[PDB]
């Protein structure tokens, strides 16, 4: 399955998504990323839509 974080920074907006076979290992890849990008905030995430979210 492949999940989506959706990016709600204070100026960086936009869309990610990465193919993985586990929720947690694709969490390493959107909050890792979030350095790179420069977007850290409050994460969440539901299984039942495949959906990531970081508010800062």
Avoid: H, P, R, S
Wanted: glycine fraction near 8%.
């Amino acid at each position: 399955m492949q999940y989506k974080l959706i990016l709600n920074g204070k100026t960086l907006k936009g869309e990610t998504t990465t193919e993985a076979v586990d929720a947690a290992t694709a969490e390493k890849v959107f909050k890792q990323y979030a350095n790179d990008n420069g977007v850290d905030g409050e994460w969440t995430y539901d299984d039942a839509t495949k959906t990531f979210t970081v508010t800062e």
